[PDB]
Each structure stands twice: as structure tokens, then as C-alpha cells.
Structure 1
Amino acid sequence: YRIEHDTMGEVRVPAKALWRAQTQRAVENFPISGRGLERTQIRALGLLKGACAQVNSDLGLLAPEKADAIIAAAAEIADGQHDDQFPIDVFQTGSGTSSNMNTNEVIASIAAKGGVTLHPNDDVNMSQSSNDTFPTATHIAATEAAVAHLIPALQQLHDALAAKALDWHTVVKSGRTHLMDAVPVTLGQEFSGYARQIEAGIERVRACLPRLGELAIGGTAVGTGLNAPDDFGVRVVAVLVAQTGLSELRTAANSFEAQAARDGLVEASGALRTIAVSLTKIANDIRWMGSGPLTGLAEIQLPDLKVNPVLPEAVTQVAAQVIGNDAAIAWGGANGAFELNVYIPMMARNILESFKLLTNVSRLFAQRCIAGLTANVEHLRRLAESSPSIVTPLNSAIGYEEAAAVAKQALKERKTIRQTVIDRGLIGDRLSIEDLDRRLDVLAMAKA
């Protein structure tokens, strides 16, 4: 319940709080959602402030005692020790300056406990602006989410689907097109399709990384780098790559584009949206395959967590959320003006949530649904044995003309190809029953 002094009056701040007057003013200004920055965003702000202090110390602009104090305080923030010291709403000034100042104030308070006096702006914000910091922290967090978390979760799900594609390679069943009975396929072939969708999703995320990983740091207020060293960005990026192991981080190709727009977030959200579209098809097919057991398809059994398909439901709900988040991201992305896009906090919340939801639900889907599925093999074969057949595989035995007459008579009389052959008296020296049954065999028709 302490009291601090701002250039517009008094400011009451909780006693255990490491934040100062500017953060408290932002708390009072933006009571909108009641939610603040996520752990990933706080970590990236800590990483960035430590790297900037490191580079300011290397260039001789910041006394080594002050840099050491910022570096140690920043490492605690990056390590998750101060996730309760960031109370500002997501829906704040659209540069994210409020959160940038929150980080400067918390580092100054941590340093003061260790006996060092730091000015939040002149020391902790040295060579930085109110406008190049929060977007840099956003792109660090998004690139870490893509590379360290989403891609491995998607690979786990790909591997689970591919393992079923191989197990079920000869588990024949009926194909369905337009929801209507079609020629045979295998359950393994369908899973090979699901696995390719997830592999393509990993390709889509990898394709966005050259632009997602672009950082604005060094551009300062408008992109020109005024009041920063000319090589500030390239030096800070090198420290961040070294500390995180994220080789995908890079300086911006164009310092104006990197601050006037957040196009890299819009691009990345489109990859995540495409993954949500793929996951919707996979999850829907799996719940339909497990439907019933008397009123539905009853092709597979899902693991029980009459089992309701609770992980397909979680997957499809997550996909809906990614689709909505993606619309919010593109709306903010389009609406920048001149030197700055002022939708960064909202865009950051949405893209980081989409990464988190897809990573977590993919791992759960892989481990607690896909890996445990069991096929109802005898039921699936009975469905394959009820698919339509074709005459083509009889051509070499009865010739193009008799085959065509079998096709026509089967259609007219609503008979199978097999029975129409028997009924036309075609079993003989040209065609044994055995040869009929081998030519029309449903696993052979699946071409597995």
C-alpha cells in the first residue's frame, strides 16, 4: 500500500509490487479484459532487455555495473520468476509502450534490491524506443512458439497418424464420397492422408519463419534508428540467437516495414488457420468413424477419457478459436498508419494464443486419441464387401463387350457385378468362380 510520485500527482502501488508509477497509471487507465501478458510475452521482454543492456555495455554506452544489474534482473524475468509483476491489460496503448515501461520499472526495482540504482528510461530503455521494443518481444515469442513448441507437437501428431497408416495398410473398408458408398479404400490410406495434412502444416509453418523471425529492434521511434547505434539491431539479434538458440531470429529486411506493419504475424496466422482447417477434417472423420455404436458408422473405437469423442471436440473447438483469432489478427494488421501499426498488443495476444492452443491440443490428440484408436477390422471388411464394384478387372477374361453388358445389366437390375456375372452364366473356362473372386477382391480394388 506504498505511495509514489508521478509528474501528474500521487500514485498508490501495492507494497510487494516491483512495478512503479507508469505501470500503476496503465492499470488504472485500461480496466478492459482483466487479463495481462502471458508468460511467453513476459519472458521475451526479459530476454530483450538483457540483450539490449549487453550491447549497450559492449559499445561503452552503459556502465558495466548497471548492465550487469539489468542482465541479472532480465534473466530472472526470462526464467519466469516475476510473472506476477505485469498487471497491465492486453487492451493498452497500441504500441505496447505500457508493457515496455512495466518491464523497465520491474528491472529497476529488482536492481535496487541488489544495491544498484537504474533509471527505467535512461538505463533500462537505453538505445530503445516506445515503438521497436514490444513488437520485437512479440516476434521473439512467436518464433520461439513456432520452432520450440508447435513444430515438435505437430511432428508428434504426424508420427502418430503415420504409425496408424502403416498398422492399417491392409484394413480394407468402404470409401465414401459425398457421404455415399464408394469403391474400397483402406483405413491406412485415409490415415496416410491425415498424416500428409499435418506434414504439410509443418511445411507451412517452416515457410513463414524467414518473415516471422524479423525483429524491429534498432529502428527506435519511426524506423530510422535515431538515438540508437547504427548496428544496434544486428548486435542485439546476435545476443538473442546465442541466448535462445533460435537461429530463425533476424534483423528486419526493411526497418520501416518492421514497424509500420505486423505483416509477419498475419502471414503466420494464415499457416495456423490452415492447420486448424486440416485438424477440423481429421477430427471430424475420426468422430464419425467412432460414432454409434448402433446408430453410427462404428468403424473404430476411441480411447475412453459408448465413449464420447471428447478430444475431437476439443480439437474442433480449438480450430474455431484459431479461425476467430486469425480474423482479429488480419483486422489489426491492415489498420496501421504511417510509421506505426498500433494493434500490437491485440495481435500478440491472438497469435500467441493460436500457437499455444494448436501445440497443446495436437500433443493431446496424438497421445490420448490417435495412438489408442482400435479398428473394428471385421466390420470394416463387411463395409468394403458392400461397396460398389466395377467391371474393368473382368476385361481380360470376358472382353470389353461382355463386361459392358455386365455393367449395363447390373445397373438396370440393381444387382452387384459379381451376381450379374453368375446370373449371365459366365462362370466357365473363360472365368472360374476363383478368378471372379480374385479379380473383384475388395483389398485388390483398394490398390494398397
Structure 2
Amino acid sequence: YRIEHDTMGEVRVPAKALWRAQTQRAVENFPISGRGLERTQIRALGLLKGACAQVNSDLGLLAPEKADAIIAAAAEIADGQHDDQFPIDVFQTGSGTSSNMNTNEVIASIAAKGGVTLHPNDDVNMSQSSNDTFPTATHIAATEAAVAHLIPALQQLHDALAAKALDWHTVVKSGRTHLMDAVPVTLGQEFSGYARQIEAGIERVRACLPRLGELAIGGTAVGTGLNAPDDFGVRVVAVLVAQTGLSELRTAANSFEAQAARDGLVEASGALRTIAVSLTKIANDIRWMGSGPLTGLAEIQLPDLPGKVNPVLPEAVTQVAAQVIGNDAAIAWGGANGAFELNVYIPMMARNILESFKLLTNVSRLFAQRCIAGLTANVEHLRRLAESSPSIVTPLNSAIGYEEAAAVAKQALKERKTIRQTVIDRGLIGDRLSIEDLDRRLDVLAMAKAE
């Protein structure tokens, strides 16, 4: 160990650690979860520190030689070379002060290995506060997770569902309402519904981006911008947009709202919770369709990871959706509980919304590639059941009457025969209608209004 210091005095730190006294106090203050910042959060903090140093350089506030050392150390952090140098718990001071200092101290220690002396606060934290930096890094990470990762994953799941919709366009089967047999549909129509739910999900994520991408940077301690250049925010956002290509990043509409609240994360979590609700419906329908092989619905076979495969990716999708619903409740609870100039639930809210992005992204790709793409339908079986259902006798009423239609339905179920065969067996052809009329009235694919 080695001795390091802060406005509170002297602290023993691991001899080899790149962090300093404030990070070490945080390590001892918050042994709560045993988990620290994720890769995406560290990347975002590195991106922001490099952008701040660039702007401080461009305004002549920071010596070119200091700004270059910060930019080089922050690039190393952003690329993942120092992840083991971020040991602070998620459950830390609610501004994320502790992780901001962690980034500053690590950058100063990297710079010192290259013979440049940087102060963690005076130079690395120049024109910045914890109050504006940790929420900015959080919104960068969330905007990147939405745009670069979740929307493409959802687009892959949409396309896999839409491909099934087309492949199964004529795969007629009984409709089910209240779990009870109903008039015919096609598997393709049901898959077109699932596809729409995922396309609407993408629309919900895109709708939240104008507020999710709002950055607090430039507001400093309380939103007033004191101790920062009047244009710090716009210059830093411009640098981040050029480095990331995330045109969704923008300066906050109101600098006070951007620090006093995290309502953009709450809004975005609502979109993710809606996607979780959609995925639960899609996954539950698929596992029920694949149920059996004898005593279940036996409509489709899921690919193995026969018709005896356990629906393991529907189970992973429904467990992920439950987690997103829980995370969403935690996010809203933190979002509501800000006071005055600062919401002090940022580390917990960041943990939850970034996890929800990650789980939905990863499970959506797995579901698309390793379940949806490989589903096979019991086509002839589905059609036979549709042709054997009491639900399709209604179009006979005007020819044979209500009472005889009911007797046809009862006999078809009892003898396990089609409606067409039961109408013929009861001797109804000729007096009431012809074979041509029967085949028109009982065409289950036409009843599904597909071609």
C-alpha cells in the first residue's frame, strides 16, 4: 500500500492501483452489492472526459500538453484497458461523485506514467461537476444502447417474425379467443401481429430519443453553469456527436430539469417495459404452440438446444421481461425522489436502465436466430383441426338451419371427423346444398380472409 490525500486527510491505497484517495474511501464506504460500473458506463465516462479536455484545450483554458495526456488516457479508458481500475459499488453517493473521481484519478495516474502531471480535479475535472458529468455519461451510455444495439436487435427480431408471416401466409389453423376454439386464422397472420408488436417497440424507442439524448454537461453544480464556459455544453456535445456518430446526443432544453430530474431515463424505461410486455405475449404464444408432443397444442416444433424440445428461449425471454419490469419499477422510484437542484438516485437508475437495454438486446437476437428462424409448422395437422372445428359450421346455418348445424358440430367432434365429412355422412347434400356450395361455405383459408 501507499499513502494518498484529499480535503479530509490521509488514506492507504493498494500500492499498484491506478485510483487514489477518493476512490479508496468509496471502496471502504460502499461494500454493498460487490458490483461496479459496467463496460458501457466506463466507456461513456472515458468519452466524456476526452471531449471535456478537447473543449477546455480549444478555449485555451487547459495547456495543450495536459489536454493531450487527458485525451490519450481517456481513449485507453473508453477502449476497456482499465476496467479493473473502477472498483466502486453501484450503490454509492447518489450523484455518482465517487465514479466521476474514479475516472479523474485513473486518468491522472495514466498521464503520470507518460511523465505528465495532471491534477484529478483542477485539470481532469476542469469546467465540470459530478452533478453534470455522471448523468451525462449515463445518458450517453443509454442513447448508445438504444441506437447502436437495441434498435438493430429488435429490427433482426422483426425481420425473423415478418419472414415467418410470409412463409406461413396460407398455414390455416383454428383461431383461439379466451383459449377457446374460434374461427380460422393463419399462422402467418398471427406472426404478422408479433412482427407489428416489435415494429411498434422500435417506434416507442425512437419516440423517447429526443429526451433520452439530452445531456446535462455545462450545468455544473446546480444547473447554472457557474465555473464553466457559457458554451461548454454545446461544444462538448458537438465533440461527442463527431466521435460517436450519435446525432441523437444534444444539449438539455433546460439545464435545471437536466440535473434536478432523470425523467428521460424513466420515459425510456417505459418503452423498454412495453417491449418486455410484447415479448412476453410473443414468447408465451410460441411455447404454447410448441407444447406436447402428445398432450399439448402441437401446432409447431421449436428447434432443439423431435417436438420434445423444452422451450428454453421462450423461458429466457419471459425471465428477461420479468427483470425489465422490476428494473422499470426501481427506475421510476428513483426518478420521483429528487430534491431541489439534484436527483441523487443516478447510479441505481443507470444500473437498471443499462441492464434492461442489454438484456433486451441480447435476448432479442438469440430469440430471432435460435428460435424464430428454425420454427416448423405442423401444416396438415393445423388445417385438419381447422376443418374439424364446430366454429366453422355457422356459414351452413342459412342452408341446413341452426338445429342441424349444431347436430353436425356435435357429430364431427364425437367422431373426430371434418365438418365437410360430417355434412356428407348426415345425408345433407342435395336437399339443402350441393358439394360446390359446401366447399365454398367451408373453405377455411377463405374464412381466414387469406389467399
Q: Distance in 2 between matches of 1:393 and 1:337?
A: 65
Whether the aligned pair in 2 keeps the contact of 1:46 and 1:75 (CA below 8 Å) is yes
Gaps of at least 5 residues in structure 2 are: none
Q: Distance in 2 between matches of 1:142 and 1:186?
A: 38
Task: Return 265-274 or 396-405, whichever deviates more.
Answer: 396-405
Deviation at 1:293, TM superposition (A): 0.7
Q: Distance in 2 between matches of 1:400 and 1:178?
A: 24
Deviation at 1:396, TM superposition (A): 8.7
Q: How does 1:145-156 map to 2 (within 5 A)?
A: 145-156=145-156
Whether the aligned pair in 2 keeps the contact of 1:301 and 1:375 (CA below 8 Å) is yes
Secondary structure at the residue paired with 1:393?
helix
Q: Distance in 1 between matches of 2:274 and 2:4?
A: 49
Whether the aligned pair in 1 keeps the contact of 2:13 and 2:24 (CA below 8 Å) is yes
Q: How does 1:228-267 map to 2 (within 5 A)?
A: 228-267=228-267
Whether the aligned pair in 1 keeps the contact of 2:299 and 2:378 (CA below 8 Å) is yes
Secondary structure at the residue paired with 2:176?
strand
Q: Distance in 2 between matches of 1:345 and 1:390?
A: 57
Task: Return 82-91 or 426-435, whichever deviates more.
Answer: 426-435
Note the alpha carbon deviations across 1:1-31, whole angstroms, 9 max, x for none: 3232344443222233111111001000000
Whether the aligned pair in 2 keeps the contact of 1:173 and 1:384 (CA below 8 Å) is yes
Q: For the structure 1 residues 307 and 210, does the alpha-carbon distance in structure 2 shift closer, same or farther, using more than 3 Å as the test?
A: same
Whether the aligned pair in 2 keeps the contact of 1:389 and 1:417 (CA below 8 Å) is no
Q: For the structure 1 residues 218 and 142, does the alpha-carbon distance in structure 2 shift closer, same or farther, using more than 3 Å as the test?
A: same
Note the alpha carbon deviations across 1:208-254, whole angstroms, 9 max, x for none: 00000000000000001011011000000000000000000000000
Secondary structure at the residue paired with 1:175?
strand
Deviation at 1:394, TM superposition (A): 5.4
Whether the aligned pair in 1 keeps the contact of 2:388 and 2:418 (CA below 8 Å) is no
When the two chains are superposed, the root-mean-square deviation of aligned CA atoms in Å is 2.7
Q: For the structure 1 residues 313 and 4, does the alpha-carbon distance in structure 2 shift closer, same or farther, using more than 3 Å as the test?
A: same
Q: Distance in 1 between matches of 2:15 and 2:414?
A: 87
Aligned length: 448
Q: Distance in 2 between matches of 1:124 and 1:21?
A: 16
Deviation at 1:434, TM superposition (A): 2.7
Note the alpha carbon deviations across 1:127-146, whole angstroms, 9 max, x for none: 00120000000000000000
Normalising by structure 1, what TM-score? 0.94
Deviation at 1:374, TM superposition (A): 0.7
Q: Distance in 1 between matches of 2:77 and 2:378?
A: 52
Whether the aligned pair in 2 keeps the contact of 1:389 and 1:416 (CA below 8 Å) is no
Whether the aligned pair in 1 keeps the contact of 2:42 and 2:77 (CA below 8 Å) is yes
Secondary structure at the residue paired with 1:308?
coil
Deviation at 1:388, TM superposition (A): 3.0
Deviation at 1:299, TM superposition (A): 0.9
Q: For the structure 1 residues 37 and 405, does the alpha-carbon distance in structure 2 shift closer, same or farther, using more than 3 Å as the test?
A: closer
Deviation at 1:423, TM superposition (A): 8.1
Deviation at 1:391, TM superposition (A): 6.1
Q: Distance in 2 between matches of 1:19 and 1:262?
A: 28
Secondary structure at the residue paired with 2:174?
strand
Note the alpha carbon deviations across 1:274-296, whole angstroms, 9 max, x for none: 00000000000011111111111
Whether the aligned pair in 1 keeps the contact of 2:153 and 2:362 (CA below 8 Å) is yes
1:215 aligned residue:
215
Whether the aligned pair in 2 keeps the contact of 1:290 and 1:301 (CA below 8 Å) is yes
Q: Distance in 2 between matches of 1:55 and 1:311?
A: 47
Whether the aligned pair in 1 keeps the contact of 2:32 and 2:89 (CA below 8 Å) is yes
Whether the aligned pair in 2 keeps the contact of 1:174 and 1:386 (CA below 8 Å) is no
Task: Return 53-62 or 419-428, whichever deviates more.
Answer: 419-428
Deviation at 1:109, TM superposition (A): 0.5
Q: Distance in 2 between matches of 1:414 and 1:165?
A: 30
